[PDB]
Amino acid sequence: EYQLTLNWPDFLERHWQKRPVVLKRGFNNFIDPISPDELAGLAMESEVDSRLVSHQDGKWQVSHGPFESYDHLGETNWSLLVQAVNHWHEPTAALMRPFRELPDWRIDDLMISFSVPGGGVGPHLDQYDVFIIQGTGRRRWRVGEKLQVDPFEAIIDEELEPGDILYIPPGFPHEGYALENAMNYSVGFRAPNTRELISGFADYVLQRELGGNYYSDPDVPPRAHPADVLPQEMDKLREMMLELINQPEHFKQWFGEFISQSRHELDIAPPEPPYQPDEIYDALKQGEVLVRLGGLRVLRIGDDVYANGEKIDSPHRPALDALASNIALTAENFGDALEDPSFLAMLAALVNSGYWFFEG
Amino acid sequence: EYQLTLNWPDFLERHWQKRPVVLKRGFNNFIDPISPDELAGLAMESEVDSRLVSHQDGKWQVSHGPFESYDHLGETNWSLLVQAVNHWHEPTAALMRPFRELPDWRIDDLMISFSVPGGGVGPHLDQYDVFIIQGTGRRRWRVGEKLQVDPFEAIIDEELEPGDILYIPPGFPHEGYALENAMNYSVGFRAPNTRELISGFADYVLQRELGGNYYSDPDVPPRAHPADVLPQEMDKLREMMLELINQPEHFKQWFGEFISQSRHELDIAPPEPPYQPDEIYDALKQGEVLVRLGGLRVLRIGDDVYANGEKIDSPHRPALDALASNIALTAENFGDALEDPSFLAMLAALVNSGYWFFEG
Ligand SMILES: [Co+2]
Ligand SMILES: [Co+2]
Q: Any residues with CB less than 8 A from the CB of B316 and at least 6 apart, and which?
């Protein structure tokens, strides 16, 4: 297990969503969870989102995966960047657990880059928070003040060593490149914008035929011009909208289903044949471990728990919270909730969806 | 011009969106704007939304237009119902002008039914207000209390004579059928529901890349379980949404474009060759009349005027208001605004869209 040496209160108070920083020796005696070869082979796979970025003579070249070969790259000036490696590699997923001092719903996935000397993606600006973890090799990283971007004056210019972490808030322009063959591990975050929220909620309202109440004007106001639309009427309409949004169970159900979805593809492999509830029970009681699929988002809002868009209900709150906060579970986590066939059938549904599995 | 004998304050106070009523002699010496033959021929056309409804032996039959023939109907138990006849027939459009005591944005279109004895659409419930105008022939109309619906006890059971009007609020079950060959003219209304508003506004926000502001949590709150989503966070998200909705120029621009669109197809026929602004000027100054396309919705919200989804701006408020409230215009309606080439070009755009034309 990876263990952060960070002062969390300090970080949250001084840096989180405020200011970038290099966390020297963030991880001690850092051992890379994955090797560049394993990463390359991973990028060879079709389900995987990867890209190769290279620069030569002031011009750039981006190529998307999956790659059949890696023959012609050169020894300098290129980088393989692979999205959501935590979806395809467990030891990599281990890198994210130290950062659970920040909320799960905000945490995104883990992107891994390998870069040869000079390799990088050039000067750019992101929109989400990120922790860039230095593995093997060395990288020069530069971050400027809050404004692909034009060259900037750097307020940070450091050479990262294994175990160093570079935190960057959204909006801060940054550029990093390899000095030696290097592995970087971006623990990325995610935050919805208002547009995404409004369109998502609108979809939710459409699909479920909510908000079927019609504008009603028994006290229809007079006007000079019959073509006019009066401010009171505009206000009434707006308040219809605001009222639907403020409805207490609709909004957070929608948000539960929406936020629990991943930005990147999961390794969904439904077991065949499917599991009966009895099977789940037996396996758990026999001491077997139930493992959450890597990257599968399980978030808790109110009484309900949401997994990959699915809403989960159960009178058994402690066990459901166990589902929410344990990536590996055992029978004692569920407790007496295992004696409820409804709960077992719920778990069996989750397993048959491939969201959770036993052992591997 | 048709002239209503209704006491409008009385109606608005006692009936509008409250209670149905028969307005005896609503129109005096009522002359039908269209004949059943003209209506049939109209339904023969492809651009027209019409349907033939018939009942026989306790079973019904609905057939959609356009119809190539009308050979086999019978002499009883059927009705032709044609949508938005005001889009295709000017004297019919004249029937709607008396009802401009109610706001334009709420007024819908005009549906005309012809029915032989026994002809009707059976017992049903609508969702919008309506004024049903009795033309030639007789119809028995029944309306029950606020609950295709099951048979009801009627609080109104009247036989309409030419010039009679039956007002029915949304939700009141009604059934009407011909006693003699009859023409009915439904001045229908329209009101958006919350769902339509939220999805429309969401579309508007998507298309125009609004609401690009991301959720920001520098003061990210602590939790017992990292999988939890806290109420403060839900509130923050909700308030992002409410804030975007409350933005003063975005909402009413969207609503302007949205509400000014018709529920039924218009007769859009762009003139060829297009009009130059000089042409518009000349025609107006020569005394020619500029006529709004039948059914074309022109509504005014704030300084802006909206036509069929298009937003129209002009420093010349009186003339724009003229565009808003006059279905037939002359040069004196526009005044000095005609000496502005920008305004002329605006009018020329409107004409070239086929939204307005000269004379016919
Ligand atoms: Co970046
Ligand atoms: Co009706």
A: B334, B335, B336, B337, B340, B343
CB contact under 8 A, B218 and A105: no
Strand ranges (E), chain A: 21-23, 50-56, 59-64, 78-82, 107-115, 130-134, 139-144, 154-160, 165-168, 174-178, 182-189, 290-292, 298-301, 304-307, 310-312, 328-329, 356-358
Q: Are A282 and A288 in contact (CB under 8 A)?
A: no
Which residue in B18, B189, B195 has the most chain A C-beta atoms within 10 A of its own C-beta, making it the best mutation to test that interface?
Answer: B195
Residue A355 CA to residue A338 CA, distance in Å, equals: 19
Show Cβ contacts of residue B221 under 8 Å, excluding neighbours closer than 6 positions: B230, B232, B233
Q: List the determination method.
A: X-ray
In whole angstroms, how far apart are CA A225 and each of A221, A335, B223, B326? Answer: 12, 70, 56, 10
Instruction: State which amino acid sits at residue B170.
Output: P
B235 and B342 housed in the same domain: yes
**Residue A226 is part of a domain; what is its CATH number?**
3.40.366.30
As given in the structure block, the two tokens for residue A134 are: 């230095």
Residue B288, judged by CB atoms within 10 A of its CB (0-12, 13-18, 19+), counts as: middle
- Residue A106 in tokens: 């905000």
Tokens of B323: 């565009």
Instruction: Please tell me whether residues B154 and B209 are part of one structural domain.
Output: no
Residue of B17, B203, B255 with shortest CB distance to A234: B255
Number of separate domains in chain A:
2
